Amino acid sequence: YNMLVFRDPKRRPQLSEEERAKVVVNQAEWPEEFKDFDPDDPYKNSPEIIKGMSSWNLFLWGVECAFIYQFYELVFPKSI
Amino acid sequence: VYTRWKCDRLPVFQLKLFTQEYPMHAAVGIFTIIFLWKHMSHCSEETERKYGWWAGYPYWRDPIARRNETKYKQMIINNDVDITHPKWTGCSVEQLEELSRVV
Amino acid sequence: VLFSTYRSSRLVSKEFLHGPVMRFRALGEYYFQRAWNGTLNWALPGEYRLYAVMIPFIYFYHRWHNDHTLDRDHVEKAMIMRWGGTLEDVRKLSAKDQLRVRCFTDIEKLYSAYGPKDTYLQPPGDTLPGKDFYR
Amino acid sequence: VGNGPTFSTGGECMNTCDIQNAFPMNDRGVRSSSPFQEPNTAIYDSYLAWTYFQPMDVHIEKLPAPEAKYYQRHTKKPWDVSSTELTEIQSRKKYFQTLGYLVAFIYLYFLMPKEKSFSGLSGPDGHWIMLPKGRPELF
Amino acid sequence: MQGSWSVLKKNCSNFFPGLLAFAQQTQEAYGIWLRIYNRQQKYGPTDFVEQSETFSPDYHKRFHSQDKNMWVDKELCTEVSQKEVARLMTYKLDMWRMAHCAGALLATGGYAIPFGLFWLANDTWVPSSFNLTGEELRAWREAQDLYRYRSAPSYLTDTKWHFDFHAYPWNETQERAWDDLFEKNDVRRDPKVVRPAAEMYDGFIKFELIRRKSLRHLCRSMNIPTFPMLARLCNGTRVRDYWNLAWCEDYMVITQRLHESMTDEELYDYAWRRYLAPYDKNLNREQLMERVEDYFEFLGPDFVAHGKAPNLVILTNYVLGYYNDPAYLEGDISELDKNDYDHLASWGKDAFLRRLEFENGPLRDQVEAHTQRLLAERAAIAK
Amino acid sequence: WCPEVRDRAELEVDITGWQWWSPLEERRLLPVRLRSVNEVREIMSKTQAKKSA
Amino acid sequence: MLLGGFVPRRFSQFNRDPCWMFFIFSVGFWLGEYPAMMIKYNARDLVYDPHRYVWSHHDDHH
Amino acid sequence: DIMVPSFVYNKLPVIHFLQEKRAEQKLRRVLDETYTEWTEELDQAHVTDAITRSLNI
Numbered sequence A: 001y002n003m004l005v006f007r008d009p010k011r012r013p014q015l016s017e018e019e020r021a022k023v024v025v026n027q028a029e030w031p032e033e034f035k036d037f038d039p040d041d042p043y044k045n046s047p048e049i050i051k052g053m054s055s056w057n058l059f060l061w062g063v064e065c066a067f068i069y070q071f072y073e074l075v076f077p078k079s080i
Numbered sequence B: 001v002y003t004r005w006k007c008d009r010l011p012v013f014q015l016k017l018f019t020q021e022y023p024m025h026a027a028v029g030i031f032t033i034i035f036l037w038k039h040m041s042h043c044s045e046e047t048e049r050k051y052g053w054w055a056g057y058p059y060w061r062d063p064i065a066r067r068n069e070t071k072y073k074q075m076i077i078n079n080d081v082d083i084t085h086p087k088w089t090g091c092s093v094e095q096l097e098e099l100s101r102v103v
Numbered sequence C: 001v002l003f004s005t006y007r008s009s010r011l012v013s014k015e016f017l018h019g020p021v022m023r024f025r026a027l028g029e030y031y032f033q034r035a036w037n038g039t040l041n042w043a044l045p046g047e048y049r050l051y052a053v054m055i056p057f058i059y060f061y062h063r064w065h066n067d068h069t070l071d072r073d074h075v076e077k078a079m080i081m082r083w084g085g086t087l088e089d090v091r092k093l094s095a096k097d098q099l100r101v102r103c104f105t106d107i108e109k110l111y112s113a114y115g116p117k118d119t120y121l122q123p124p125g126d127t128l129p130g131k132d133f134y135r
Numbered sequence D: 001v002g003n004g005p006t007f008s009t010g011g012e013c014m015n016t017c018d019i020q021n022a023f024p025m026n027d028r029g030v031r032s033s034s035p036f037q038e039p040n041t042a043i044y045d046s047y048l049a050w051t052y053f054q055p056m057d058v059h060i061e062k063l064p065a066p067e068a069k070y071y072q073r074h075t076k077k078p079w080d081v082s083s084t085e086l087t088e089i090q091s092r093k094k095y096f097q098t099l100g101y102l103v104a105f106i107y108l109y110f111l112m113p114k115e116k117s118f119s120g121l122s123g124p125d126g127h128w129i130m131l132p133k134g135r136p137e138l139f
Numbered sequence E: 001m002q003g004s005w006s007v008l009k010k011n012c013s014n015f016f017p018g019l020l021a022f023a024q025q026t027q028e029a030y031g032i033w034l035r036i037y038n039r040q041q042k043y044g045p046t047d048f049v050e051q052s053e054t055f056s057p058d059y060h061k062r063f064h065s066q067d068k069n070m071w072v073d074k075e076l077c078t079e080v081s082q083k084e085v086a087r088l089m090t091y092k093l094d095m096w097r098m099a100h101c102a103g104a105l106l107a108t109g110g111y112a113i114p115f116g117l118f119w120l121a122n123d124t125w126v127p128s129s130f131n132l133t134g135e136e137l138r139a140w141r142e143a144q145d146l147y148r149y150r151s152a153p154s155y156l157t158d159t160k161w162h163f164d165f166h167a168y169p170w171n172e173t174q175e176r177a178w179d180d181l182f183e184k185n186d187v188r189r190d191p192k193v194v195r196p197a198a199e200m201y202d203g204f205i206k207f208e209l210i211r212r213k214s215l216r217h218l219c220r221s222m223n224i225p226t227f228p229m230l231a232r233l234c235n236g237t238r239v240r241d242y243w244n245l246a247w248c249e250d251y252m253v254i255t256q257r258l259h260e261s262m263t264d265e266e267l268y269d270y271a272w273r274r275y276l277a278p279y280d281k282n283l284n285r286e287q288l289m290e291r292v293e294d295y296f297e298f299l300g301p302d303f304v305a306h307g308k309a310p311n312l313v314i315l316t317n318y319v320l321g322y323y324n325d326p327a328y329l330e331g332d333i334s335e336l337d338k339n340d341y342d343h344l345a346s347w348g349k350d351a352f353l354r355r356l357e358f359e360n361g362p363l364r365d366q367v368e369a370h371t372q373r374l375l376a377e378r379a380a381i382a383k
Numbered sequence F: 001w002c003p004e005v006r007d008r009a010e011l012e013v014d015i016t017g018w019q020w021w022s023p024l025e026e027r028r029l030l031p032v033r034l035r036s037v038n039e040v041r042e043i044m045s046k047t048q049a050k051k052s053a
Numbered sequence G: 001m002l003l004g005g006f007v008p009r010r011f012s013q014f015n016r017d018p019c020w021m022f023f024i025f026s027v028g029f030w031l032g033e034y035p036a037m038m039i040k041y042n043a044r045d046l047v048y049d050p051h052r053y054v055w056s057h058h059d060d061h062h
Numbered sequence H: 001d002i003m004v005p006s007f008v009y010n011k012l013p014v015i016h017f018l019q020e021k022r023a024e025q026k027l028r029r030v031l032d033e034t035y036t037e038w039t040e041e042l043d044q045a046h047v048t049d050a051i052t053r054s055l056n057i
C-alpha cells in the first residue's frame, strides 16, 4: 500500500511452493502484536505511543495551534 | 598506514588538497576573488536607495545622510580639519564673517 | 615543533565527555544507520520518517523567521506611509487601529494579482484621501 | 537480540549490484549484505529493491583463542591513528559542532535582526570604517 | 618524524661544523662528478651524450628513456672506485636538500628564519653531515627510514591500483609475478618469480611515461625534496641520475664481488642506499647478503651482459616493498567479546524494527507461508 | 581487526582511486578455490612424472 | 531515496510512531490555518484602510 | 568527514573478498608443491654377488 509517495516495503518470498506447503503455522508462538498478521495492515494491533492519544487528537492539536497563531493578535494586539 | 585525509589535521589537509590536488582551481579562484573585489565592490548612494533596502529607502529619516554626517564629523574631529579654510569655502575668513553678518 | 601536523597528537583524554557523546551518537545512529536509509549523494535519505519530521520543522522555522523579521518590514513601511509617514504618527494610533491596518495589508498580500484593483486604485469620485493628503 | 545496526548497505540489492560476487550467497539464494556469512538475509521490494539482514541469536563453534604472537603486528607509527580512535575524535568534534550550529541556528532564525529596517527599530543601518585618524596633512 | 627540542638543540650545536663538512664533501664530490662526467662524455653512446628525445605517444611530452638516456659505464672502476660513487650519491641527496633550503632562504630573505627553526627541529631534511656522533647518525637514519615508511605504501598502492583497474596480466606466470611483487616485507619474494612483472609493466608503462603524482610519491619514498615540484622532468632527472649511479656501482660490485669483502656497516649502508635494508630492522649480515643477492638476481643476467636493468618503475616498487610493513594490529583477542552498540539499548525497537524481526526472525518461514496463503486466498476470491 | 583491508582501501582512496569495483582482479581471482582430493592426486602424479623426466 | 520505513496504513495509525505523530500535527496546522484565514479575512467587521489610496507598493516600485 | 569515509566503506567488501581469494590461492599453491619422494637404493643382491666373487666361489 501507499501513503502519498511512501510505499510499504514487501518481503520477497524465499521458499518454494513445495517447501512452503510443508511449513506448519503456529500463531501461539507469535507475539501478541503480530497475530492474524495481514500484509495490507501489519500495524493494526501495534500499540499506541501514548495511551489515549489518537491521530485525530494530534490533528486537532495542530489545527488549534494554527488558530492561535492566526487569532492571538486579534485578542491581545500590540503597538508598533 | 599513512594517509593525508586520516592522519593530517584539517589545515594541513586543506593546504595539501589545494596545493597538490587542485592547485589550478585554487589559483583561478583567487584570481576571480581579486577581480570581484577590484571591480564589483562599490555601491553608490543612488543605487542603495533604489535597490539597497528590503522594503525601500526610508526617506522620512534618510539614514544615508546621518551615516555620512557621522563619518564626516568623525573625520573632522580626529584629523583636526579647519573646515573654515578658504579652500573649503572658496572665500577668505573676513569675507565669510561679512557674509554671516549680511545673512 | 610548536604544533603537530598529525591528528594523533591528542589534546584530551579518550574518556572526556564520553557519556554525552555516546547519547548524541545514539540519537544520530538509531534512524540513520539502517539498510533502508540509502542516501542519494548524502542529501536525500531513504527513511520516510526523516522527511516527515524534517520538512515540517524546516517550514516552521523558515515561516517564523519570514513573518517576524522579513514581512514585518513591509508591514511597518505600509503603516508609516499610509498614516503620516513617520513612526510617531503611527504610534499615535491605538493597538486596534494598527491591527486593522496590518490585517488590511495581509488582505492585499492574499489578493495580489487576482484581487480587486480598487484596493490600490482610487475610483473617480471617491471621497477617501488621495496621495497628496499628507503633502 | 539487540537493536544495533550492521554493516552498511547503502540501500543496494546485492543480488544485482556490480560487485555481487563479493557477497556470499546462502542456501536460500539471497546474497549477504556484508562480507560475513548470513543465514537469514532477505530482500524487500519498495520502489527499489534492497537487501536486509536481521540480527539473531545464533551459536557458532568458537575456535580457541590463539597466541598474541600469531596475530599481533607491532608496526604502529606516530602518524597512525586507529579507526576506533578516529571514531572517538570525530564523535567529539561533531558533538561540539552540532551544539555550535544549534546555537547559531537559534540566534539567526529567532534573535538576529535584519539590517536596514524601514522603521529603524531593529538592525543596523551600516557605518563607515577604516577612517583616517591623526593625519591632519591628509586634508 | 615529528620535530623535537632535543633534535633542535643537536642541529643548532652542530650547524657550523656541519656546514664545513658539507663544503668539504662538496669539493670532493665535485671532483668525483667531474671525473664521471668526463668519462661519460668521452666514452658514452651517441644517444646518451646527445640527449636523444623520447616523447610520449599521447601528448608528446619529453622524458628520460631508460634504454637511451641511461648508460652503465662498465669500465668506470678504472677511474672511480665504488666508495667514491657511494659518497657522490650521499652528497647528491644532501646537496639536493641543502639547495632547496638555500633557495627558500634566498627567495624569502630573512623571513625564513622561523621556518629554519622548524627545519632544524627535525632530522628528516637535515644533511647527514650535521651528525657528529654515532647516536646522532642513528637517529638521523631512523628519521629517514620513518619518512620512507610514510611514503612508500602510497606509491605501491598507486601503481598496483592503476594497473589492476586499467589492465590485467596476459599469462599465469605474469599473474603470479604481479601478485607476489606487492607482498609485505614479512615474507620473502623470489626475484625469479617476480621478474616478468617488469616486462608486463614495460608493456603497460615505461619510465618515460611515469605520471607526475607517481613521481612525487617515488621522490617522497627516496628522501628527495619535492617542494617546489615543478615539471615532472626535474625530479625525474634527479631519479635518473641517482639510479644510474646506483647501477654503475652495482655493476662494479657484481663484476668484482666487492660485497663479499665489504664489511658489515658498509654492506648495510649499501643496502640502505638501495632501499632494501631499513636500519630499524636490525638485520644481520646473513639477511643483508640475502637481500643484496636477491636484488642482483632481480637485475638479471642481462644487466651484466649489456648493462640493461629491468623497468625502473617495477624495480623501485620491488625495492620499496621492503618498507611496506604488515598492517599493525594491537590488542588482545578478548577485546572482541565486547559490544559496540550498547548505547542504543535504551532506545529499544520501534514498530518497524519489531515487524522486521518478526518477519526475518526464526519464525520467518511460518510468517512467509501464512502471508503467501492469505494472498493466494485473496487473489482467488478476487477472481 | 582486519588491518590489510583497511589499509588498502584507505590508500586506494587517498591516491584518487575512488572506484570500489575491480572487475579485472576479480576475474583473475574469481575461480580460485581449494582443490578436491582427486585433483590433488592428479597434480601430484603430474609433479612426480615431471620429476622423473 | 524512498526505500523504506514505517508507513501508516490509514489515518488512525499515525499515532503508532512519534515521527508520524509530529507529521500529522504539522498537517493539522497546515490545513487548519486555511479556515482560520477564511474566518479572519472574510469577517463582517473587517474594514479596508481609509488611507489605502494614500500610498501603495505599485507606485513605490514603479 | 563524509566522502572519503563513504568510499572506503564501499571499498571494504571487494578488498576483503579478493584478499580471502589470495590467501586461498597461497594455500593451494602450498599444497600443490608437496610430492612424496621415492629414492632408489642399490639392490643388496649385487652386493651378495660381489661377496661371492670375493669368496672365489
Ligand SMILES: CCCCCCCCCCCCCCCCCC(=O)OC[C@H](COP(=O)([O-])OCC(O)COP(=O)([O-])OC[C@@H](COC(=O)CCCCCCCCCCCCCCCCC)OC(=O)CCCCCCCCCCCCCCCCC)OC(=O)CCCCCCCCCCCCCCCCC
Residues within 6 Å of the ligand: B030, B033, B034, B035, B036, B037, B038
Ligand atoms: C602581513 C601580510 C602580508 C603583507 C605584505 C607582504 C609583502 C607582499 C606580499 C604579496 C603582495 C602581492 C601584491 C599584488 C600581486 C599581484 C596581484 C594583484 O594585482 O593584487 C591586487 C591587490 C594588491 O594591491 P597592489 O596591486 O599590490 O597595490 C595596491 C593597488 O594600488 C590597489 O589597486 P586595486 O585597484 O587593485 O585595489 C583594489 C583592491 C583589490 O583587493 C582585492 O581584490 C582583495 C583580494 C583578496 C584576495 C585574498 C587571497 C587569499 C584568498 C584565500 C581564500 C579565501 C576564500 C574565501 C574566504 C571568505 C571568508 C573569509 O586592492 C586593495 O585594497 C588591496 C588590499 C589587499 C588586502 C589583502 C587582505 C587579504 C585577507 C585574506 C582574508 C582571509 C580570511 C580567511 C579566514 C579563515 C578562518 C578559518 O590585492 C592583492 O594583492 C590581494 C592578495 C594579497 C595577498 C597578500 C599576502 C597573503 C595574505 C596576507 C594577509 C592575511 C590576512 C588574514 C586575515 C584574517 C582575519 C581573520
Ligand SMILES: CCCCCCCCCCCCCCCCCC(=O)OC[C@H](COP(=O)([O-])OCC(O)COP(=O)([O-])OC[C@@H](COC(=O)CCCCCCCCCCCCCCCCC)OC(=O)CCCCCCCCCCCCCCCCC)OC(=O)CCCCCCCCCCCCCCCCC
Residues within 6 Å of the ligand: E026, E029, E030, E033, E095, E096, E097, E098, E099, E100, E101, E102, E103, E104, E106, E107, E228, E234, E237, E238, E241
Ligand atoms: C642573488 C640573486 C637571487 C635571485 C633570486 C633567487 C630566488 C631563489 C631561487 C633558487 C635559486 C638557487 C638556490 C640555490 C641552489 C643551489 C645551487 C644549485 O643549483 O644546486 C644544484 C642543484 C641542482 O639540482 P639537480 O636536480 O641535481 O640538477 C640536475 C642537473 O642535471 C644538474 O646537472 P648535472 O647532473 O650535470 O650535475 C651538475 C652538478 C655537479 O656538481 C656537483 O655535483 C657538485 C655540487 C654542486 C652544487 C652544490 C650546491 C650546494 C647548495 C647548498 C649551498 C649552501 C647553503 C647554505 C645554507 C646556510 C647558509 C647560512 O652541479 C650543479 O648542480 C650545477 C647546476 C647548474 C648551475 C645552477 C646555478 C645557476 C644560477 C647561478 C648563476 C647566476 C648567474 C647570474 C648572472 C647575472 C647576469 C646579469 O640545485 C637544486 O637542488 C635545484 C634548486 C632547488 C630549488 C628550486 C626552487 C625553484 C627555483 C625556480 C627559479 C626560477 C628562475 C628564477 C626566478 C624565480 C622567480 C620566482
Ligand SMILES: CCCCCCCCCCCCCCCCCC(=O)OC[C@H](COP(=O)([O-])OCC(O)COP(=O)([O-])OC[C@@H](COC(=O)CCCCCCCCCCCCCCCCC)OC(=O)CCCCCCCCCCCCCCCCC)OC(=O)CCCCCCCCCCCCCCCCC
Residues within 6 Å of the ligand: B008, B011, B012, B015, B016, B019, B027, C001, C002, C003, C004, C005, E001, E002, E003, E100, E101, E102, E104, E105, E112, E113, E115, E116, E117, E118, E119, E120, E121, E122, E124, E125, E227
Ligand atoms: C637559523 C636557521 C638556519 C638558516 C636558515 C636556513 C633555511 C631555512 C628555511 C628553509 C626550511 C625548509 C624546511 C622546512 C620544514 C618545516 C616546514 C613546516 O612548516 O613544517 C610544518 C611545521 C611542523 O613540522 P613538524 O612538526 O616537524 O612535522 C613535519 C612532518 O614531516 C609533516 O610533514 P608534511 O609533509 O605533512 O607537512 C607539509 C605541510 C606543511 O604545512 C603545514 O604543515 C602547515 C603549517 C601551518 C599550520 C598552521 C596551523 C595553526 C593555525 C593557527 C591559526 C591562528 C590561531 C589563533 C592565533 C591567535 C593569536 C593571538 O604541507 C605543505 O608542505 C603544504 C605546502 C603549501 C605551499 C603553499 C604555496 C602557495 C603558493 C601560492 C600560489 C601561487 C601560484 C602562482 C601565481 C603566479 C602569479 C603571477 O608546522 C609548524 O611548526 C606549525 C607552526 C604554526 C605557527 C603558529 C600559527 C601561525 C602564526 C602566524 C603568525 C603571523 C604573525 C604576523 C601577522 C601579521 C598580521 C597583519
Ligand SMILES: CCCCCCCCCCCCCCCCCC(=O)OC[C@H](COP(=O)([O-])OCC(O)COP(=O)([O-])OC[C@@H](COC(=O)CCCCCCCCCCCCCCCCC)OC(=O)CCCCCCCCCCCCCCCCC)OC(=O)CCCCCCCCCCCCCCCCC
Residues within 6 Å of the ligand: B010, B011, B014, B015, B016, B018, B019, B020, B023, B024, B026, B027, E100, E101, E103, E104, E107, E108, E111, E125, E216, E225, E226, E227, E228, E229, E230
Ligand atoms: C580550517 C581552516 C584552516 C586555515 C586555512 C588557511 C587559509 C588557506 C586558504 C587557501 C589554501 C589553498 C591555497 C592554494 C594556493 C595555490 C597553490 C598553487 O597553485 O600551488 C601550485 C604549486 C604546488 O606546489 P608543488 O611544488 O606542486 O607541491 C606542493 C606540495 O605542498 C608539496 O608537498 P610534498 O609532500 O611534495 O612536500 C612536502 C615537503 C617536502 O620538503 C621539501 O620540499 C624540502 C623543504 C623545502 C622548503 C621550501 C623550498 C622553497 C624553494 C623556493 C621556492 C620558490 C620561491 C619563489 C620566490 C619567492 C616568492 C614568494 O615540503 C614542505 O614541507 C613544504 C614546506 C612549506 C612551508 C610553508 C607553507 C605555507 C605556510 C604559511 C607560511 C606563509 C604565511 C604568509 C602569510 C602570513 C604573513 C604574515 O605551487 C608551487 O609550484 C610552489 C611555488 C612556491 C613559491 C613560493 C611561495 C609563493 C606564494 C607567496 C609566499 C609569500 C611568503 C610571505 C612571507 C612572509 C611575509 C611577511
Ligand SMILES: CCCCCCCCCCCCCCCCCC(=O)OC[C@H](COP(=O)([O-])OCC(O)COP(=O)([O-])OC[C@@H](COC(=O)CCCCCCCCCCCCCCCCC)OC(=O)CCCCCCCCCCCCCCCCC)OC(=O)CCCCCCCCCCCCCCCCC
Residues within 6 Å of the ligand: E055, E060, E061, E062, E063, E230, E231, E232, E233, E234
Ligand atoms: C616574484 C617572481 C615572479 C615571476 C614571474 C615570472 C613567471 C614565473 C617565474 C618562474 C617560476 C618557477 C617555475 C617556472 C616553470 C618551470 C617549468 C619547468 O619545470 O621546466 C623544466 C625545464 C627543464 O627541463 P629540460 O628537460 O631541461 O627541458 C624541457 C624540455 O624541453 C621539455 O620537453 P617538451 O617535450 O615538454 O617540449 C615542450 C617544451 C618546449 O619548451 C621548452 O621547454 C623550452 C624552454 C622554453 C622556451 C620559451 C621561449 C620560446 C620562444 C619564444 C619566442 C617569442 C618571440 C616573440 C617576438 C615578439 C616581437 C615583438 O614546452 C613548450 O613547448 C612550451 C613553449 C612555451 C609556450 C608559451 C606560450 C605562451 C602563451 C602566451 C599567451 C598570451 C599571454 C598574454 C598576452 C601577451 C602579449 C600581449 O626548464 C626549462 O627548460 C626552462 C625553464 C624556464 C623557467 C622560467 C624562468 C623564469 C625567468 C623569469 C625572469 C623574469 C622575472 C620577472 C619578475 C617580475 C617581478 C616579480
Ligand SMILES: CCCCCCCCCCCCCCCCCC(=O)OC[C@H](COP(=O)([O-])OCC[N+](C)(C)C)OC(=O)CCCCCCCCCCCCCCCCC
Residues within 6 Å of the ligand: B031, B032, B034, B035, B036, B038
Ligand atoms: C549592471 C552592469 C552589469 C555588468 C556585468 C558585466 C559582467 C561581470 C561578470 C563578473 C563575474 C564573472 C567574472 C569572471 C572572471 C573575469 C576575469 C577578468 O576579466 O578579470 C581581468 C582583470 C583585469 O585586471 P585589471 O582590471 O587590474 O587590469 C589592469 C589593466 N590596466 C592597468 C591597464 C588598467 O583581472 C583582475 O581583476 C585580476 C588581476 C590580478 C590577478 C592577476 C595578476 C597577474 C597578471 C599577469 C599579467 C600581467 C603581469 C605580468 C606577468 C606576471 C609578473 C609577476
Ligand SMILES: CCCCCCCC/C=C/CCCCCCCC(=O)OC[C@H](COP(=O)(O)OCCN)OC(=O)CCCCCCC/C=C/CCCCCCCC
Residues within 6 Å of the ligand: C001, C002, C003, C004, C005, C009, C010, C011
Ligand atoms: C616557545 C616558547 C619559548 C619561550 C618560553 C615561553 C614560555 C611561556 C610560559 C608557558 C607556560 C605554560 C606552558 C604549557 C604547556 C605548553 C605545551 C605546548 O606548547 O604545546 C603546544 C600545544 C599544542 O600541542 P600539540 O600540537 O597538540 O602537540 C604538542 C606536541 N608536539 O598548544 C596548546 O595547546 C596551547 C598552549 C599554550 C600555552 C601558553 C604558551 C605561551 C607562549 C608565549 C611565548 C612568548 C614569550 C612568553 C614570555 C613570558 C615571560 C614570563
Ligand SMILES: CCCCCCCCCCCCO[C@@H]1O[C@H](CO)[C@@H](O[C@H]2O[C@H](CO)[C@@H](O)[C@H](O)[C@H]2O)[C@H](O)[C@H]1O
Residues within 6 Å of the ligand: E037, E038, E039, E041, E042
Ligand atoms: C653559473 C654556471 C655554473 C655552472 C656549474 C657547472 C660547471 C660544469 C663545468 C664542466 C666542465 C667540463 O669540462 C669540459 O668537459 C668536456 C667533456 O670532457 C670537454 O670536452 C672535450 O671532450 C669531449 C669528449 O671527447 C668532446 O666531445 C669535446 O669536443 C671536447 O672539447 C671539454 O673540453 C671540457 O672543457
